[PDB]
């Protein structure tokens, strides 16, 4: 009897090969997410869990799964995992600190370009068969000579700033914890207050985690500050914005556009989360969406899976996992 | 009576005010493209013309318009304008050398990201109302650790290289006019042969003008060399590629994707040009398209128009235009 490991979502077969000598595997090698009932059934006597974005762990989950030694999260933002409750039950909780950063940064910039240049509608027009040559339309907004404001300047903020260096924009940021002035200057970043960031930015790129303090940070009052036509890009967590306020800002035309890779409906730890994305937001023309594909780059996903696998194996071996969030004796 | 200037497409009000005290303006302040005959009719007794991407000027056109002194083009690629015939008939042909570069480079990188990451299908999926959370789907290709190959390293090529500096890609290029080593080193560029460029690149970014030598340069023989899954992005001219060969490459699955801002049907100077984009190419999933919006940024278009206006005004005043493509004896 090897320790039992439940992997809640599909992974590369070579990751299964890496784990199999050490672990009895209970896998989900499909593109589907299992019911919460079935995850509980599988994890009841599991020694370990590899968890993904659709997963949620609270005290109630853990009491129902008394054999767990480690939850290895193949993700960065562990807002749906109660770390304190894990520590209390003697369960390691591990994450992936760096591997999701670059592909998410790349996508966020592509969304900003895609949103500013009306890519969805432009591509729709070409596919329709009615392109008859160059026309005066689909006039958009570029990054050259624009002010780009970042809310947050951790891993993804810095990766995005790195990638905008050749782009002719004026970069500013708001943080809970400032960069050192030397790094600011190497990247051409100026630190500003949050109100000013929203009042003065042509592109607003969110790069902050979801917590009690950032929940609905981007609300109606903050959005009412933006320059008419400002573009808002959300690659972080859905619930840092109030999507109802975002939609209202779009409909009034104060917000020029909203691009998102993440949605309030995904933030499982939120009882008052909406059950879906508002259909009126989904149908609004001044939008561009992706289904949480920030890290959806083939080579990176394998590396992310390997990182979670390694952390789990470290825990099961009686070591402190390299990427543990918590501390155990 | 002031000289007649035919402006073929809609122009910002700031530009008309600049032109009014110098020319009798025959304008087209609609967002519609007029017919070839309508242009001929208006230009028959015109001293000047402001021309745009849909316009084509050939030997017969200039013969029908003996009064022309200048054709100011609000564009970079003048492949639809017979420069030689302009020179022969003593007509200035002007362009806009730099203003289109940046917004086109921005869009091109945007297309590369969008194509690599399956943006069209991803967005359609969310819009369907069926998104229920993350799934291990839409896995694609990023620029980090990728090899990016530039065919051409002029204005747009250089601007794209500039904009990829922090992206962790290996940048290589082929050119007709090679960069000096110190510029190559400054941008982290490595010069390669065209065949090696196509054989070794994950992303192929086209940055060439269309001329006799570049017509169907990206053909079936060249596309046969690409790595499986290679992504091709075309922000320059449709006819630099053979769209039929591109489609065939997509269908066999050797080419991973094709993104384009420009299409063969736009290249009026070609008699054998296809009259539309192949419906089969339009319908292929591994594609991303824009309708020649490379420079479609409000601030930028105002400046492009002012540039073309300034060139026309300079010519009509008896000066040589700052952005003349051709040379005329004085
Ligand atoms: N879309 C995706 O696939 C994807 C991928 C990775 C991460 N994410 C999400 O993006 C978030 C940020 O990612 P990261 O890797 O940059 O995290 P990080 O922890 O490296 O950086 C987060 C930064 O936000 C700052 N911050 C906290 N509260 C703030 C506030 N009120 N105002 C301004 N800044 C504040 C923190 O000081 C920190 O520097 C993650 O927590 C995760 O939720 C999404
Ligand atoms: N999509 C748009 O809206 C848009 C905007 C601007 C320009 N364009 C098009 O893109 C083209 C390139 O633009 P640019 O501003 O970089 O022009 P450019 O003249 O500055 O650069 C073209 C470069 O390509 C090189 N070249 C020529 N033949 C080559 C070959 N066979 N192999 C490799 N390199 C070769 C030339 O030496 C030159 O350096 C323009 O001619 C125009 O047709 C499109």
XYZ file of C-alpha atoms and ligand atoms in Angstrom:
747
model
C 0.000 0.000 0.000
C 1.626 3.191 -1.301
C 0.249 6.583 -0.192
C -2.897 7.442 -2.152
C -2.749 10.595 -4.304
C -5.853 12.115 -5.897
C -5.187 14.279 -8.943
C -8.341 16.263 -9.586
C -7.633 17.265 -13.208
C -5.814 15.955 -16.295
C -2.014 15.960 -16.238
C 0.700 14.843 -18.675
C 1.201 11.057 -18.694
C 4.881 11.452 -17.805
C 3.875 13.213 -14.567
C 1.795 10.140 -13.742
C 4.930 8.062 -14.504
C 6.975 10.214 -12.120
C 4.398 9.765 -9.337
C 3.395 6.095 -9.828
C 6.368 4.431 -8.046
C 5.671 6.448 -4.892
C 1.902 6.864 -5.009
C -1.273 4.938 -5.670
C -2.905 7.198 -8.266
C -6.542 8.221 -8.460
C -6.680 10.323 -11.611
C -9.086 12.351 -13.737
C -7.586 12.098 -17.223
C -10.452 14.001 -18.879
C -11.055 17.703 -19.598
C -13.987 17.732 -17.175
C -14.191 18.908 -13.566
C -15.695 16.354 -11.174
C -18.553 17.064 -8.777
C -17.658 18.262 -5.265
C -19.363 15.042 -4.046
C -17.013 12.873 -6.152
C -13.889 14.807 -5.090
C -14.868 14.201 -1.442
C -15.480 10.506 -2.139
C -12.049 10.136 -3.756
C -10.151 12.188 -1.150
C -11.735 10.582 1.946
C -8.802 8.183 2.497
C -6.237 10.001 0.340
C -2.779 10.836 1.691
C -2.286 13.564 -0.916
C -4.099 15.806 -3.383
C -2.924 17.676 -6.446
C -5.367 20.564 -6.695
C -6.161 22.941 -9.533
C -8.037 26.218 -10.013
C -11.517 24.652 -9.776
C -10.718 23.176 -6.338
C -11.761 24.550 -2.942
C -10.455 23.445 0.443
C -12.006 24.589 3.720
C -12.124 23.162 7.271
C -15.184 21.076 6.369
C -13.364 19.467 3.440
C -10.398 18.636 5.677
C -12.492 17.058 8.470
C -14.021 14.790 5.823
C -10.506 13.917 4.542
C -8.573 12.994 7.713
C -5.700 11.169 6.002
C -4.420 14.121 3.938
C -0.747 15.010 4.471
C -0.314 17.489 1.599
C -2.333 19.486 -0.879
C -0.072 20.330 -3.833
C -1.590 23.238 -5.727
C -0.700 23.598 -9.382
C -1.473 27.329 -9.289
C -0.298 30.692 -7.886
C -3.309 32.240 -6.151
C -4.457 29.896 -3.383
C -7.391 32.129 -2.283
C -9.762 29.111 -2.357
C -7.570 27.156 0.080
C -7.829 27.791 3.837
C -4.112 27.696 4.778
C -4.724 28.161 8.530
C -7.199 25.253 8.521
C -4.590 23.145 6.691
C -1.921 23.974 9.283
C -4.410 23.080 12.063
C -4.997 19.594 10.576
C -1.245 19.022 10.001
C -1.595 19.329 6.219
C 1.081 20.848 3.972
C -0.206 23.355 1.431
C 2.111 24.076 -1.495
C 1.921 26.360 -4.538
C 3.750 27.320 -7.741
C 5.359 30.721 -7.098
C 6.913 31.588 -10.477
C 6.014 29.333 -13.437
C 2.606 30.923 -14.188
C 4.033 34.477 -14.288
C 5.419 34.829 -17.826
C 2.637 33.221 -19.880
C 0.042 35.209 -17.885
C 2.016 38.432 -18.497
C 2.207 37.629 -22.232
C -1.551 37.008 -22.413
C -2.365 40.185 -20.459
C -0.405 42.304 -22.945
C -2.043 40.465 -25.888
C -5.464 41.159 -24.336
C -4.582 44.857 -23.947
C -3.610 45.043 -27.636
C -6.592 42.878 -28.656
C -9.006 45.019 -26.649
C -7.578 48.374 -27.760
C -7.592 47.390 -31.444
C -11.084 45.817 -31.502
C -9.623 42.431 -32.569
C -12.774 40.338 -31.945
C -14.977 42.560 -34.140
C -12.197 43.110 -36.704
C -11.658 39.362 -37.128
C -15.427 38.809 -37.260
C -15.623 41.304 -40.142
C -12.896 39.597 -42.195
C -14.399 36.122 -41.635
C -17.793 37.405 -42.871
C -16.461 37.611 -46.457
C -17.303 41.314 -46.730
C -13.780 42.744 -46.509
C -13.430 44.878 -49.637
C -10.085 46.519 -48.847
C -8.849 49.170 -46.414
C -11.647 51.239 -44.876
C -11.819 54.049 -42.314
C -13.030 51.860 -39.400
C -11.988 49.799 -36.340
C -10.035 52.839 -35.162
C -8.556 51.916 -31.795
C -6.089 52.775 -29.049
C -2.405 51.822 -29.038
C 0.176 51.607 -26.279
C 2.526 54.199 -27.794
C 2.215 57.486 -25.881
C -0.376 55.945 -23.515
C -0.257 55.889 -19.717
C -0.343 52.300 -18.445
C -1.247 51.890 -14.787
C -0.651 48.670 -12.867
C -2.627 47.782 -9.771
C -0.065 45.463 -8.161
C 3.632 45.057 -8.933
C 4.586 41.561 -7.804
C 5.555 38.755 -10.163
C 3.021 39.435 -12.961
C 3.187 43.240 -12.650
C 6.985 43.128 -13.002
C 6.838 40.658 -15.914
C 4.350 42.921 -17.704
C 6.475 46.015 -17.006
C 9.540 44.130 -18.353
C 7.619 43.328 -21.535
C 6.398 46.890 -22.092
C 9.895 48.444 -22.033
C 10.136 48.941 -25.823
C 6.534 50.153 -26.217
C 6.701 53.957 -25.685
C 4.220 54.076 -22.794
C 4.347 55.948 -19.481
C 4.266 53.340 -16.705
C 2.877 53.892 -13.206
C 1.761 51.577 -10.405
C -0.050 51.320 -7.096
C 1.082 48.773 -4.501
C 0.455 47.637 -0.953
C 4.236 47.185 -0.815
C 6.395 49.460 -2.986
C 9.322 48.433 -5.167
C 12.755 49.762 -4.278
C 13.465 53.025 -6.148
C 16.332 51.410 -8.081
C 14.016 48.778 -9.631
C 11.371 51.465 -10.325
C 13.922 53.456 -12.340
C 15.249 50.418 -14.229
C 11.653 49.871 -15.415
C 10.556 53.530 -15.672
C 7.820 53.050 -13.064
C 6.397 55.814 -10.868
C 4.500 54.927 -7.672
C 1.095 56.601 -7.296
C -2.005 56.473 -5.096
C -4.813 54.157 -6.221
C -7.288 56.988 -6.926
C -4.726 58.774 -9.132
C -3.889 55.511 -10.947
C -7.512 55.131 -12.052
C -7.930 58.843 -12.849
C -4.811 59.112 -15.036
C -4.348 55.791 -16.851
C -5.318 54.919 -20.439
C -4.773 51.215 -19.758
C -5.356 49.765 -16.308
C -3.770 46.317 -15.828
C -4.704 44.460 -12.606
C -1.997 42.299 -11.025
C -3.045 41.721 -7.422
C -4.282 38.711 -5.422
C -7.793 38.123 -4.077
C -8.201 38.578 -0.322
C -10.554 40.275 2.162
C -8.846 43.639 1.409
C -8.944 43.412 -2.410
C -12.475 41.989 -2.688
C -14.389 44.370 -4.975
C -11.507 46.870 -4.760
C -12.361 47.907 -8.317
C -15.870 49.122 -7.533
C -18.313 51.699 -8.949
C -16.723 54.556 -6.993
C -13.213 53.768 -8.268
C -14.424 53.169 -11.839
C -16.241 56.524 -11.841
C -12.766 58.107 -11.676
C -11.518 56.804 -15.053
C -10.917 58.838 -18.203
C -13.752 58.226 -20.677
C -12.602 55.359 -22.897
C -10.061 53.884 -20.434
C -9.323 50.188 -20.952
C -9.329 47.713 -18.071
C -7.539 44.342 -18.254
C -8.008 41.654 -15.569
C -5.632 38.642 -15.632
C -5.600 38.113 -11.857
C -8.872 37.250 -10.039
C -12.459 38.033 -11.035
C -13.545 39.282 -7.612
C -10.988 42.080 -7.333
C -13.543 43.817 -9.594
C -17.291 44.204 -9.180
C -18.426 42.900 -12.609
C -21.840 44.560 -12.253
C -20.087 47.909 -11.802
C -17.798 47.093 -14.739
C -20.780 46.348 -17.012
C -22.529 49.573 -15.961
C -19.334 51.531 -16.692
C -19.155 49.891 -20.161
C -22.811 50.604 -20.935
C -22.433 54.282 -19.979
C -19.267 54.441 -22.132
C -16.973 55.695 -19.368
C -15.071 52.435 -19.544
C -13.932 51.914 -23.141
C -13.361 48.199 -22.709
C -12.946 45.281 -20.339
C -10.669 42.305 -21.038
C -10.656 39.396 -18.597
C -9.047 35.983 -18.151
C -10.785 35.480 -14.779
C -14.329 35.801 -13.420
C -16.168 36.327 -10.118
C -18.038 33.029 -10.617
C -14.744 31.124 -10.198
C -14.010 32.421 -6.708
C -15.446 29.409 -4.892
C -14.603 30.621 -1.375
C -17.112 33.446 -1.973
C -20.615 32.578 -0.786
C -22.085 35.668 -2.480
C -20.253 34.974 -5.770
C -22.432 35.121 -8.905
C -23.271 31.709 -10.387
C -22.309 32.794 -13.898
C -20.961 35.707 -15.922
C -23.746 38.240 -16.605
C -25.002 37.496 -20.153
C -25.117 41.260 -20.790
C -21.366 41.439 -20.078
C -20.733 38.412 -22.313
C -22.611 40.077 -25.171
C -21.123 43.579 -24.766
C -19.035 44.575 -27.834
C -16.318 46.373 -25.863
C -14.883 43.229 -24.295
C -12.375 40.412 -24.811
C -12.435 37.209 -22.764
C -10.403 34.072 -22.106
C -11.379 31.063 -19.949
C -8.630 31.283 -17.298
C -5.900 30.450 -19.847
C -3.158 32.680 -18.361
C -0.800 29.730 -17.918
C -2.130 27.648 -20.845
C 1.197 27.252 -22.632
C 2.058 23.593 -23.322
C 5.647 23.478 -22.009
C 4.805 25.597 -18.958
C 1.849 23.414 -17.897
C 4.102 20.337 -17.829
C 6.596 22.271 -15.662
C 3.757 23.427 -13.363
C 2.510 19.849 -12.969
C 6.064 18.667 -12.227
C 6.471 21.368 -9.573
C 3.275 20.300 -7.801
C 4.336 16.644 -8.128
C 7.768 17.341 -6.618
C 6.225 19.245 -3.691
C 3.809 16.393 -2.975
C 6.647 13.830 -3.113
C 8.774 15.947 -0.742
C 5.893 16.097 1.770
C 5.178 12.358 1.575
C 8.894 11.689 2.207
C 8.786 13.644 5.496
C 10.571 16.704 4.144
C 9.413 20.316 4.171
C 8.170 20.930 0.597
C 10.213 23.586 -1.218
C 7.118 25.622 -2.108
C 5.127 25.193 1.114
C 3.001 28.196 2.093
C 2.680 26.970 5.685
C 5.087 25.527 8.263
C 4.774 22.161 10.024
C 6.995 20.490 12.670
C -8.383 79.948 -59.015
C -6.393 77.651 -56.721
C -5.170 74.180 -57.838
C -7.647 71.283 -57.549
C -6.813 68.665 -54.887
C -8.742 65.390 -54.951
C -8.781 63.739 -51.507
C -10.116 60.233 -52.121
C -11.064 59.342 -48.518
C -12.305 60.955 -45.278
C -9.902 63.353 -43.585
C -9.827 65.003 -40.132
C -11.144 68.580 -39.939
C -7.755 69.883 -38.748
C -6.293 68.739 -42.102
C -8.937 70.462 -44.268
C -8.243 73.754 -42.450
C -4.542 73.310 -43.259
C -5.336 72.689 -46.945
C -8.222 75.134 -47.591
C -6.254 78.412 -48.031
C -4.148 76.717 -50.745
C -6.383 74.341 -52.724
C -9.854 73.934 -54.171
C -10.835 70.796 -52.268
C -12.667 67.992 -54.054
C -13.202 65.850 -50.958
C -14.871 62.572 -50.011
C -15.901 63.062 -46.376
C -17.821 59.777 -46.390
C -16.529 56.414 -45.142
C -17.146 54.830 -48.563
C -14.625 53.995 -51.302
C -15.566 55.501 -54.675
C -15.254 53.588 -57.968
C -12.225 53.712 -60.307
C -14.226 55.759 -62.849
C -15.350 58.239 -60.158
C -11.695 58.845 -59.202
C -10.774 59.301 -62.888
C -13.679 61.739 -63.351
C -12.648 63.853 -60.337
C -8.902 63.708 -61.082
C -9.207 64.609 -64.798
C -8.409 68.295 -64.142
C -6.719 67.973 -60.734
C -3.265 69.366 -59.915
C -2.953 67.264 -56.754
C -4.249 64.029 -55.231
C -4.256 62.626 -51.708
C -4.318 58.855 -52.165
C -5.013 56.018 -49.724
C -4.610 52.207 -49.571
C -7.582 51.398 -51.883
C -6.146 53.631 -54.637
C -4.217 52.408 -57.672
C -2.364 54.747 -60.035
C -0.969 53.351 -63.306
C 0.285 54.686 -66.677
C -3.255 55.043 -68.092
C -4.391 56.950 -64.979
C -1.680 59.612 -65.322
C -2.349 59.884 -69.061
C -6.011 60.637 -68.277
C -4.863 63.236 -65.717
C -2.296 65.521 -67.433
C -2.619 68.312 -64.828
C -1.255 66.328 -61.839
C 1.849 67.658 -60.087
C 1.767 65.514 -56.925
C 0.251 62.316 -55.574
C 0.488 62.367 -51.772
C -0.052 58.873 -50.403
C -1.214 58.487 -46.806
C 0.592 55.134 -46.519
C 3.983 53.344 -46.520
C 3.727 50.595 -49.159
C 3.214 52.253 -52.553
C 3.119 49.006 -54.551
C -0.191 50.034 -56.210
C 1.386 53.215 -57.609
C 3.524 53.151 -60.749
C 6.427 55.288 -59.517
C 8.239 54.945 -62.870
C 5.230 56.350 -64.764
C 4.952 59.185 -62.238
C 8.621 60.056 -62.762
C 8.227 59.852 -66.572
C 5.285 62.295 -66.493
C 6.916 64.672 -63.993
C 4.610 63.799 -61.096
C 5.809 63.722 -57.479
C 4.901 60.565 -55.584
C 5.114 60.916 -51.792
C 4.624 58.529 -48.849
C 4.639 58.392 -45.035
C 7.923 56.712 -44.059
C 7.593 56.336 -40.276
C 4.161 57.077 -38.737
C 2.553 53.727 -39.629
C 5.417 51.677 -38.161
C 4.611 51.605 -34.429
C 0.846 50.841 -34.488
C 1.501 48.091 -37.067
C 4.288 46.580 -34.926
C 1.976 46.645 -31.880
C -0.802 44.876 -33.788
C 1.622 42.280 -35.218
C 2.823 41.244 -31.737
C -0.837 41.257 -30.627
C -1.667 38.876 -33.483
C 1.302 36.643 -32.594
C 0.082 36.390 -28.983
C -3.574 35.950 -30.024
C -2.751 33.260 -32.595
C -0.409 31.341 -30.264
C -2.931 31.364 -27.423
C -6.095 30.438 -29.382
C -7.731 33.778 -28.533
C -10.633 33.632 -31.051
C -11.835 30.185 -29.908
C -11.160 30.969 -26.236
C -13.229 34.182 -26.371
C -16.040 32.443 -28.295
C -16.104 29.762 -25.588
C -16.549 32.280 -22.720
C -19.174 34.195 -24.736
C -21.154 30.938 -25.240
C -22.295 31.034 -21.588
C -20.853 27.552 -20.973
C -17.702 28.470 -19.002
C -17.805 26.806 -15.576
C -14.184 27.245 -14.519
C -10.619 26.425 -15.542
C -10.125 23.317 -17.684
C -6.889 21.852 -19.096
C -7.843 23.290 -22.516
C -6.559 25.878 -25.033
C -2.914 25.012 -24.325
C -0.877 27.014 -26.836
C 2.489 28.575 -27.675
C 4.185 31.492 -25.896
C 7.073 33.741 -26.903
C 9.263 32.921 -23.882
C 12.045 30.492 -24.982
C 10.627 30.592 -28.526
C 12.596 31.358 -31.680
C 11.155 34.387 -33.482
C 12.246 34.847 -37.110
C 11.854 38.213 -38.861
C 11.745 38.259 -42.657
C 12.810 41.858 -43.196
C 14.394 44.208 -40.657
C 13.396 47.692 -41.795
C 11.072 50.060 -39.948
C 8.453 47.509 -38.816
C 10.996 44.708 -38.269
C 13.068 46.971 -35.988
C 9.981 48.208 -34.107
C 8.866 44.622 -33.463
C 12.379 43.639 -32.316
C 12.328 46.680 -29.983
C 8.994 45.522 -28.573
C 10.165 41.946 -27.909
C 13.233 42.920 -25.832
C 11.919 41.692 -22.454
C 10.076 38.656 -23.853
C 12.738 35.940 -23.444
C 12.685 34.965 -27.133
C 15.628 34.196 -29.422
C 15.491 36.809 -32.184
C 16.823 36.026 -35.674
C 16.345 37.687 -39.056
C 16.944 37.562 -42.789
C 17.475 40.762 -44.777
C 18.274 42.097 -48.227
C 20.161 44.953 -46.527
C 21.930 43.435 -43.489
C 22.260 45.399 -40.247
C 25.679 46.407 -38.957
C 27.033 44.177 -36.170
C 26.675 46.858 -33.476
C 22.912 47.192 -34.111
C 22.561 43.383 -34.252
C 24.264 43.146 -30.853
C 22.174 46.020 -29.430
C 18.920 44.165 -30.223
C 20.163 40.587 -29.720
C 19.601 39.745 -33.396
C 21.303 36.990 -35.377
C 21.368 37.122 -39.194
C 20.337 33.872 -40.917
C 19.553 32.670 -44.452
C 15.896 32.750 -45.546
C 15.689 28.948 -45.733
C 17.163 28.591 -42.225
C 14.840 31.345 -40.940
C 11.818 29.326 -42.103
C 13.288 26.014 -40.925
C 14.196 27.063 -37.372
C 11.539 29.579 -36.210
C 8.552 29.067 -33.881
C 7.102 32.438 -34.895
C 7.695 33.882 -38.366
C 6.975 37.618 -38.568
C 6.834 39.125 -42.057
C 8.162 42.658 -42.482
C 8.759 43.039 -46.242
C 7.508 45.366 -48.958
C 5.663 43.880 -51.940
C 7.609 44.094 -55.213
C 8.643 41.911 -58.168
C 11.178 39.993 -56.050
C 8.910 39.459 -53.007
C 5.739 38.345 -54.852
C 4.892 34.847 -53.540
C 8.249 34.588 -51.738
C 6.490 32.672 -48.963
C 5.453 29.796 -51.233
C 4.792 26.042 -50.941
C 8.510 25.192 -51.258
C 9.463 27.523 -48.395
C 6.503 26.506 -46.188
C 7.622 22.873 -46.582
C 10.647 23.733 -44.396
C 8.789 24.960 -41.286
C 8.796 23.175 -37.939
C 5.480 21.462 -37.182
C 3.273 24.030 -35.435
C 5.197 27.123 -36.600
C 3.156 30.340 -36.497
C 3.137 32.774 -39.426
C 2.148 36.421 -38.964
C 1.676 38.765 -41.925
C 1.282 42.499 -41.206
C 2.895 43.682 -44.464
C 1.338 42.708 -47.836
C -0.951 39.808 -48.755
C 0.926 38.856 -51.920
C 4.253 38.261 -50.161
C 2.607 34.923 -49.323
C 0.801 32.412 -51.505
C -2.432 32.176 -49.476
C -3.298 28.897 -51.239
C 0.019 27.377 -50.103
C -0.548 28.796 -46.595
C -3.992 27.126 -46.444
C -2.553 23.814 -47.664
C 0.142 24.066 -44.970
C -2.542 24.673 -42.305
C -4.650 21.715 -43.509
C -1.788 19.182 -43.422
C -1.011 20.587 -39.956
C 2.578 21.638 -40.672
C 1.801 25.324 -40.232
C 0.359 25.762 -36.733
C -1.319 29.080 -37.496
C -1.652 32.056 -39.830
C -2.443 35.602 -38.745
C -2.773 38.448 -41.250
C -3.693 42.152 -41.365
C -3.349 42.140 -45.159
C -4.614 40.025 -48.061
C -3.780 39.189 -51.704
C -7.102 40.663 -52.904
C -5.843 44.147 -51.874
C -2.899 44.150 -54.242
C -4.583 45.928 -57.178
C -1.389 46.233 -59.266
C -1.613 42.465 -59.860
C -3.818 41.441 -62.797
C -4.110 37.819 -61.606
C -4.915 38.731 -57.983
C -7.655 36.656 -56.334
C -10.855 38.695 -56.040
C -11.547 37.639 -52.439
C -10.028 35.759 -49.508
C -10.637 32.012 -49.844
C -13.714 31.118 -47.724
C -11.773 27.998 -46.701
C -8.949 30.112 -45.259
C -11.466 32.368 -43.494
C -13.056 29.264 -41.942
C -9.840 27.594 -40.746
C -9.603 27.526 -36.903
C -5.849 28.169 -36.767
C -6.107 31.766 -37.980
C -6.584 35.342 -36.810
C -7.438 38.248 -39.121
C -7.728 42.035 -39.140
C -9.000 44.216 -42.052
C -5.813 46.260 -42.740
C -6.018 48.131 -39.416
C -2.229 48.210 -38.910
C -2.264 52.005 -38.552
C -5.924 52.462 -37.517
C -5.200 54.527 -34.371
C -6.952 57.943 -34.217
C -3.964 59.977 -33.023
C -1.735 58.275 -35.625
C -4.092 58.687 -38.639
C -4.399 62.433 -37.972
C -0.599 62.631 -38.153
C -0.417 60.463 -41.310
C -2.951 62.775 -43.004
C -1.010 65.881 -41.939
C 2.186 64.345 -43.335
C 0.548 63.623 -46.711
C -1.027 67.102 -46.739
C 2.328 68.774 -45.968
C 3.947 66.891 -48.876
C 1.192 67.961 -51.300
C 1.420 71.609 -50.170
C 5.218 71.570 -50.567
C 4.939 70.224 -54.120
C 2.226 72.704 -55.163
C 4.379 75.543 -53.802
C 7.164 74.490 -56.194
C 9.331 72.815 -53.550
C 10.481 69.200 -53.524
C 8.362 67.239 -51.023
C 10.143 66.048 -47.858
C 8.816 62.497 -48.354
C 9.034 62.171 -52.134
C 9.499 58.538 -53.218
C 10.781 59.504 -56.659
C 13.213 62.158 -57.861
C 12.441 64.897 -60.349
C 14.915 67.288 -62.016
C 14.656 70.877 -60.766
N -4.892 34.264 -14.980
C -4.045 33.339 -14.526
O -3.971 32.249 -15.062
C -3.185 33.661 -13.334
C -1.888 33.164 -13.249
C -1.112 33.494 -12.140
C -1.653 34.298 -11.140
N -2.917 34.759 -11.227
C -3.482 35.619 -10.163
O -2.807 36.891 -10.174
C -2.491 37.272 -8.834
C -1.206 38.071 -8.846
O -0.181 37.214 -9.342
P 1.357 37.414 -8.976
O 2.072 36.156 -9.405
O 1.753 38.751 -9.523
O 1.244 37.485 -7.362
P 2.347 38.112 -6.371
O 1.954 37.657 -4.984
O 3.740 37.812 -6.858
O 2.045 39.673 -6.537
C 0.863 40.246 -5.995
C 1.174 41.688 -5.621
O -0.047 42.383 -5.382
C 0.210 43.324 -4.350
N -1.021 43.824 -3.687
C -1.728 43.246 -2.695
N -2.774 44.050 -2.385
C -2.700 45.137 -3.183
C -3.466 46.285 -3.323
N -4.561 46.483 -2.552
N -3.118 47.205 -4.248
C -2.043 47.036 -5.028
N -1.286 45.938 -4.914
C -1.595 44.983 -3.999
C 1.165 42.611 -3.403
O 1.916 43.553 -2.621
C 2.023 41.808 -4.354
O 3.230 42.517 -4.658
C -2.328 35.960 -8.085
O -2.565 36.109 -6.680
C -3.349 35.061 -8.745
O -4.590 35.250 -8.058
C -3.680 34.461 -12.299
N -0.587 46.625 -42.196
C -0.346 47.921 -42.322
O -1.194 48.748 -42.026
C 0.998 48.360 -42.827
C 1.573 49.525 -42.325
C 2.823 49.916 -42.787
C 3.461 49.130 -43.744
N 2.895 48.002 -44.226
C 3.593 47.182 -45.233
O 4.757 46.551 -44.682
C 5.899 46.768 -45.522
C 7.174 46.898 -44.703
O 7.063 48.084 -43.928
P 8.333 48.873 -43.348
O 7.797 50.177 -42.832
O 9.132 47.942 -42.469
O 9.137 49.161 -44.706
P 10.722 49.401 -44.826
O 10.941 49.785 -46.264
O 11.200 50.327 -43.735
O 11.393 47.970 -44.576
C 11.347 46.919 -45.535
C 12.588 46.056 -45.337
O 12.433 44.768 -45.942
C 13.681 44.413 -46.549
N 13.572 43.404 -47.633
C 13.230 43.622 -48.912
N 13.248 42.449 -49.583
C 13.618 41.490 -48.712
C 13.809 40.118 -48.818
N 13.618 39.488 -50.002
N 14.184 39.414 -47.725
C 14.374 40.022 -46.542
N 14.198 41.348 -46.410
C 13.824 42.102 -47.483
C 14.256 45.731 -47.046
O 15.677 45.646 -47.167
C 13.822 46.703 -45.968
O 14.840 46.836 -44.967
C 5.579 48.041 -46.295
O 6.232 48.078 -47.571
C 4.076 47.985 -46.436
O 3.789 47.253 -47.632
C 1.687 47.605 -43.779
